[PDB]
Symmetry: C3
């Protein structure tokens, strides 16, 4: 017993020092492995060396910003005062310079590119104007979030699309995510056997979703996801000027699904204002999760375009949300509380993985049941429309025919050419009434038809559309905004915050409309930047 | 801003007028489409014209009954007083006339028809007498509900079976329902692939259930289901004299499943009396849902017989409920509250569809798990009985052999001939211990064997039974009354009304027995009316 | 009415007499059937006669012990007093005799058997010593439970393994269980079709689990399971000296899963001491449920070894629990309350079956989702380790390679030979990180490779291992202790006893360690007793 007591006392004395020493030893061993790998063959060790260098740089940056925050603020303070003193006259100069730059760039670039590249900008203006017309509180609107959101969308699109080094990186990331979800697919062969490929949707895709959920739970436990969310949220906060919680949610939704994104700020969900809740819902509807990215890339959709649309949607979502539902009440939640995100209660990484996997049970069942019901309803609608048309000697009437004409103006305003506008409208209708999976499947069929080659017109029916229309469709359809998703989001949010149940239902439909409009704005910018083939 | 305010004021002024104008314009457009279709070719447009005519007739009837209710009541009032004044002597005359008519009809028709058809009437009397013997409160019984229920069953059966125009309509409706669910069958190919036919029960049937649930939720939101329920409930109320809530529930169960039927009067479940709760459970157990109708028709079961049994069961269920558990306490719930049914809270039709689809998740899983467990138990029971019989040199002993002898008297009393009574008893045992699905499957196998033709007796074992026995089996087995299904009904009812859990548990078994007896009474009437082949 | 009243009075008078008479008549009929079967052919009727004889003997024994308990206690009392009077000097004599017998038995047998058999006893000593070193309260320990637990384990292993009559009985029981669950396998063909064999794990095994749950619920309602639990618990209580509640829980866990084990003493969970809660958790972690027994036997694992390990684990679990976390506070719960177990509230057997089947829905879904997630994580881990190894010119690095070296000492201390220690270590790592199912699958693959025959070494990689190593692996891996089960057990126990939630969370890891240590002790005993092939 005496030896046990002495050992306990010794452990108590050196606890912090022992933890520091063991962590340092582990880090030193990792560095030794890296240096040995570099010594043996640097070319093979290049990725590990790059990862180590970037990790060290980020850690040093974080430590410096933490420790020296006061000094940096003191250094920045005089500049802010000088700018404020001269701001009154200088604001007009800045605005005039920005307008002149916009005019010059638009004229030169878009005029040289062609007429269609300019209709995209026209559609962007039209969409922003229409959102302003039908706003909840038109009189009280803050234009800084809207203008900064559009500017950030433009800058990100310009960098990613007009620069080859930017273009390649997103393709590389898309390939990596596809490979990760391919690893996901293989693991599900055990449970359902090697004949799991027979039932493609139920066996591959739903385990893909489950594995993504488990991985996200594990990363949340480790504390990586939170870091990236904080970085992007700080960028949006320091530029757009939005509230902290809505910014954090918007940053999270880029790689998190709509259902699980509010869990980031669940503890403060009861106290959020109506505007912030509408912003949360709009961000949820306007961005897709990482799980579907692999499947969509597999269909044939471009990885770079998908990732660019996902990144660009969040600023668009916030801007459109602010313009649609401007805030009229003070925000109670503080920045420090919002940025802080509680880690998983799971004791160890494997418990976090188990808890993350278990949650997915409901989601897959809901998705499958909803798909079955809505596809059956679509078949019945097609049969009934065909029956009705036969009376008037037009037996070809169907859901697709109606949706082609109904949604054509939106496709045309986005910058698609006249002929392909109907085809894009069909996809937009499929995305609206049914989940985007089917619309992306149709788009992949069209892309395959174009790639194979052959007659553009087998008969008076067009078979495939141009590359630029495909890019614009990829941007437009990158969202979870569906008439079926409306119910599940309402249910989940009301479950998280029962007190706010009355508020959640009121703003859901406006949130869905705002999400669709944000997708349209992203498509407009992409069309404006992409050249005609 | 001023223009927006003026527009808002103008919209506020004409709100009701604008809604009326837009609805009228839509109706006028529909009428124009109908008239154009009739002009072009009346023969093709015949169904649309008939539907429009019947809809207009029903709308006008409803409007007139609403507006002129007081005038009609005033006109009816003197007749009621005159009847009441002379009722004392006239009641004996009416009863004697009814008895004489019953005697004449029974004698002529059944005596000419044969002996077996008369045993059906004998069995009807026997079942009613036995129910009266073992009533909860034999002294206090109201015979008007029982007599009116039997009379309505007889009238509906007579009309549907003995008249060709009545017989054809129910076949037509059965075909329509079959096609309507076939639309669901196709829709589930997407989720489970084109090889879904490999696993027949799990893939086709459960999506059939899901689609039926979604369609029922959508119709409930629109407000059609409620209309038919109100009409049939009013008929039963004005003839049988039962309480309003039980009548509403019974009318709904004709096309609604037992699990979802109480949702019609969910808000008033806490305050219902014990007798009304027993009536609800009996109505739930004695009728089948619309979802299984398509599958059962597909197996080979006659559509007209299935629909006729479903329609006839509800009056039988109410009459047997009243006789078995007569009410001894006053009914609190009013007619207006009961007939009024709150529409779905879903904001839009598609939200209603999603919510209806989501609820079905539990039901399908419960059905699958229960079927797996009970079929495994059946296999074990057969193996153990065969093992025991071999000791006594009878290795063929099995569940079917015992159930053939055990349930033979019930089959014989229903009017089935002596030879086929054992085969009907096997089906009755399968229906009692396991769901009606397996029993209908066996009946379909027997019907196919009869239709193919061949030896009636391959050996001393009979292979198939006569057509009339098949009809009586179709009537007898049209119910959801099973031992396995007892638990789920109790769970659902307790979930809806936690306060009444003690009342729910006490009366479940009696309700199940009452439902089985109501099914037997319907089978007896069908046997009485159907001629010997 | 008067006749009904007279009948009711007559029934009330003879209630108890009538019930006794009807039960006696049924028993007499069963006896007549048995005697007729014996008359016709005794050889065929042997099993039924044996079952009847054993049942009669057990009923008579229970009745006699009930009625004559006071007389037996009075007869036993003088012996207890005489032993207590002379215990002071006699205890040393007893301990010395036990030690001398242990020395003689160890020397004579093991020295003859070889070096390998003795390392198992050495490992047993090492494990006990290590558990004693790191005890929660090392100063205060009661050694009688530990010594008696080890003695009972040794005796049971000796009887079952070294005697042919004992060895055959467990094989017979295993075959019976395998057939009993093969009955379940057939029953699931209906729901999933005759092509259910295509998806082996999802369709066969999960229905096996469902059927086991249903049968266990039915037996719990009938009241058989409780009888066996009481008998074994009384044996453990009268020999080991543990508290009644922990003994009751441990005895049940032999054939009951960890999740449902505390429901036996749920009402008293709030008042249990910390040590008793630790014992409950340890017993839960160290034993497998009956459902997996059929599947594991089907894979090829020996039935006798599986059943022997399951039986032996509970005494080992209790002994290790007491040694690791000794009790420091008084037990409030009484023996009578603990032994008494409330029966299921289900009204009839079929309601119990339905309720048992319904409960299994969550378990199967959780198991499938966890398997998918963890297998995907394993694939990703193997790919990443292979990528890292290639940099250092060792592309074969993988999870198996690391776990072979990491867990080798544990395998060696159990008595496995040097060459097979690494192969056993891979299985131990699989069991620790993932559920025992995958480890047993790998063991079955190895057993099949051995049985088929061929090269022991296709190359410098060993292909299959010896029989004794397979037996030791079977003993070692018979547990539910996994890093993922940590969360599920904590959640389940905390759901039952919110008051003790903090204690449940505090003492989970120690129980998880103790379960693996107890499994290792059982494996050590099995290795010590099993001869080298
Ligand atoms: C799984 C994908 C390929 C699919 O075809 O499903 C369609 C619907 O699944 C919803 N969904 C999906 C993922 C997620 N988190 O990863 N949260 C969601 O809500 C979402 O509404 C979408 O429309
Ligand atoms: C689904 C059919 C084809 C089947 O084979 O399963 C039999 C069991 O399904 C229950 N059931 C069915 C439908 C419904 N609403 O549409 N409510 C229910 O409860 C019903 O009680 C019976 O026991
Ligand atoms: C079930 C078999 C076929 C399987 O492959 O999965 C293994 C996992 O199933 C858990 N399990 C199992 C039974 C039970 N009660 O009978 N309670 C449980 O928790 C337990 O954790 C184990 O690891």
């Amino acid at each position: 017993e005496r030896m046990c007591g002495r050992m306990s006392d010794f452990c108590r004395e050196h606890k912090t020092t022992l933890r520091y020493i063991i962590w340092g030893i582990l880090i030193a061993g990792y560095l030794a492995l890296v240096i040995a790998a570099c010594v043996m063959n640097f070319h093979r060790a290049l990725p590990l060396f790059v990862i180590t260098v970037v990790a060290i740089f980020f850690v040093v940056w974080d430590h410096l910003m933490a420790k020296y925050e006061s000094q940096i603020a003191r250094f920045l303070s005089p500049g802010q005062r000088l700018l404020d003193s001269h701001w009154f006259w200088l604001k007009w100069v800045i605005w005039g310079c920005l307008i002149l730059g916009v005019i010059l760039w638009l004229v030169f670039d878009t005029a040289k590119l062609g007429q269609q590249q300019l209709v995209s900008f026209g559609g962007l203006i039209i969409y922003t104007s229409l959102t302003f017309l039908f706003s909840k509180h038109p009189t009280k609107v803050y234009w800084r979030p809207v203008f900064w959101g559009i500017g950030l969308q433009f800058l990100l699109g310009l960098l990613i699309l007009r620069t080859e080094p930017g273009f390649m990186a997103f393709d590389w990331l898309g390939k990596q995510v596809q490979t990760f979800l391919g690893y996901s697919d293989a693991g599900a062969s055990f449970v359902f056997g090697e004949k799991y490929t027979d039932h493609f949707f139920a066996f591959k895709v739903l385990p893909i979703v489950i594995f993504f959920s488990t991985v996200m739970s594990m990363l949340y436990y480790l504390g990586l996801m939170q870091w990236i969310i904080r970085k992007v949220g700080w960028v949006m906060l320091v530029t757009m000027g939005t509230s902290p919680v809505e910014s954090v949610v918007a940053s999270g939704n880029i790689f998190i699904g709509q259902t699980e994104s509010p869990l980031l700020v669940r503890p403060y969900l009861p106290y959020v204002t109506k505007s912030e809740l509408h912003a949360i819902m709009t961000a949820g509807f306007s961005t897709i999760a990482g799980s579907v990215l692999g499947a969509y890339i597999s269909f044939g959709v471009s990885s770079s375009h998908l990732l660019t649309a996902s990144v660009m949607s969040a600023p668009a979502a916030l801007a459109i949300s602010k313009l649609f539902w401007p805030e009229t009440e003070t925000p109670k939640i503080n920045l420090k509380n919002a940025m802080k995100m509680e880690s998983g209660d799971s004791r160890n990484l494997l418990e976090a993985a188990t808890q993350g996997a278990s949650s997915s049970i409901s989601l897959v069942a809901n998705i499958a049941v909803n798909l079955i019901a809505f596809l059956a309803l679509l078949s019945f609608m097609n049969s009934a429309l065909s029956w009705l048309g036969n009376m008037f000697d037009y037996p070809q009437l169907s859901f697709e025919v109606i949706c082609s004409y109904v949604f054509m103006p939106f496709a045309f305003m986005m910058g698609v050419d006249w002929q392909d506008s109907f085809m894009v409208a069909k996809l937009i209708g499929y995305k609206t009434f049914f989940n985007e999976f089917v619309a992306y499947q149709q788009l992949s069929k069209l892309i395959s038809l174009r790639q194979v080659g052959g007659p553009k017109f087998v008969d008076g029916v067009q078979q495939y559309m141009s590359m630029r229309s495909e890019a614009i469709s990829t941007y437009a359809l990158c969202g979870f905004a569906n008439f079926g998703s409306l119910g599940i989001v309402i249910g989940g949010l009301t479950s998280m915050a029962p007190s706010r149940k009355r508020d959640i239902t009121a703003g859901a439909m406006r949130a869905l409309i705002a999400g669709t409009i944000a997708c349209f704005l992203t498509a407009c910018i992409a069309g404006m930047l992409t050249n005609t083939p």
